[PDB]
Write a protein that binds this ligand. Structure first.
Ligand SMILES: [Cu+2]
Length: 105
């Protein structure tokens, strides 16, 4: 896979890891819709809003399978550790007008 999943469950915003690269979700948007990171980095999405959101990568992007992340409640978080250079587009499953990308290089 081009990413590993530290936790299949969301977890509390306060539990975000030192060194994680944070993307806030607020105002029905990924607040950093184009993020550039290094191989080995952990990206953590944190939902800052009442409405639930996830991150969803279709099949062939992070590996063979689609990665449909868990729904994050307000002040919940979810991480992916990127292990290979590339450009990885994602969207929010319930809100597909929410689009983002992670560029690993
Ligand atoms: Cu959403």
């Amino acid at each position: 896979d081009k990413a590993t999943i530290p936790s299949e469950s969301p977890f509390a915003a306060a539990e975000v890891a030192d060194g994680a690269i944070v993307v806030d979700i607020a105002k029905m948007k990924y607040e950093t819709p184009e993020l550039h990171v290094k191989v080995g980095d952990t990206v953590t999405w944190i939902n800052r809003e009442a409405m639930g959101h996830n991150v969803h990568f279709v099949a062939g992007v992070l590996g063979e399978a689609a990665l449909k992340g868990p729904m994050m409640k307000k002040e919940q978080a979810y991480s992916l550790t990127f292990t290979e250079a590339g450009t990885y587009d994602y969207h929010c499953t319930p809100h597909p007008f929410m689009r983002g990308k992670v560029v690993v290089e």
